[PDB]
Amino acid sequence: GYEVHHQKLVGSNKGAIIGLMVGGVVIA
Amino acid sequence: GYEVHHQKLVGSNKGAIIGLMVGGVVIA
Amino acid sequence: GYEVHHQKLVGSNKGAIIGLMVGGVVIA
Amino acid sequence: GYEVHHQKLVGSNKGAIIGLMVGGVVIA
Amino acid sequence: GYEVHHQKLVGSNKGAIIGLMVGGVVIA
Amino acid sequence: GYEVHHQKLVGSNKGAIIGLMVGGVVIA
Amino acid sequence: GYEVHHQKLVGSNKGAIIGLMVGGVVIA
Amino acid sequence: GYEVHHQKLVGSNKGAIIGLMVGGVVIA
Amino acid sequence: GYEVHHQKLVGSNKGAIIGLMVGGVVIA
Amino acid sequence: GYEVHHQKLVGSNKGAIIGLMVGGVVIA
């Protein structure tokens, strides 16, 4: 399937992340 | 399938990320 | 299939990213 | 700006919604 | 700015919703 | 600007929705 | 600008939707 | 500008939709 | 299939990216 | 098939990118 020997990963949020939005308002 | 020996990954958000939007408003 | 020896990856958002939009408004 | 008199809104998820993904795996 | 007189809103999840994912696995 | 008298809206996910992806794998 | 008297809207996903992709793999 | 009396809209995805792609692979 | 020895990848958004849009409005 | 020894890739958005559009409006 999926195989990796050696790795380094980074994820970062500094803003807005939304899954499901109804009717709202998002700024920046 | 999918194979890798050595890697480095970065992901970053500094703005707005939305999955599913109904009727709302997004600024920047 | 898919094979790599050595790599570096970057992904960045500084604006608006939307999956599915109904009826709404996006500015920048 | 933005103006509405009368409305009805629905949003629904039955699958996978992701904002920011690094290195992972998504099935269906 | 933003104005509405009369409204009805619904949001529902029956699956997977994630903000920020590093290295994990999501099924359905 | 933006103006509406009367409306009905629906948004639905039954699959995969991703904002920002680095290096990962998506099936269906 | 933008004006509507009466309307009905539907949006649906049954597959894969991606905003920004780096290096990854999408099947269906 | 943009004006409508009466309308019905549908949008549907059954496959792969990508915004911005770097280096990756898409099947179907 | 797909094979690479050595590589560097960058992806960046500074504007609007949308997957599926119904009826909405996008500015910049 | 597809083979590379050494490479550098960049992708950038500074405007509007849309996958599938029904009935909406895009400015810039």
Numbering used by the authors:
A (entry chain I), B (entry chain G), C (entry chain E), D (entry chain H), E (entry chain J), F (entry chain F), ...: 1 to 28
Paper text:
Discovered in three individuals from a family in Sweden, this mutation gives rise to a dominantly inherited form of early onset fAD. Post mortem analysis of Uppsala APP brain tissue is consistent with typical AD pathology, showing abundant deposition of extracellular Aβ plaques, primarily composed of AβUpp(1–42)Δ19–24 or an N-terminally truncated form, alongside intracellular tau tangles. To summarize, we solved the fibril structures underlying the tau and Aβ pathologies in a transgenic mouse model and a patient carrying the Uppsala APP mutation, the first known multi-codon deletion mutation in the APP gene leading to AD.
The 3D structure of the most abundant first polymorph (PM1), that was solved to a resolution of 3.4 Å, shows two identical intertwined LU-shaped protofilaments related by a pseudo 21-screw symmetry. De novo atomic model building was possible for the ordered core between G9-A42(Δ19–24). Residues G9-K28 form the L-shaped domain, preceding the C-terminal U-shaped domain (K28-A42). The N-terminal domain is fixed in its position by a hydrogen bond between Y10 and G37. However, they all share the same C-terminal U-shape formed by residues K28-A42, which folds around a hydrophobic cluster of residues A30, I32, M35, V40, and A42.
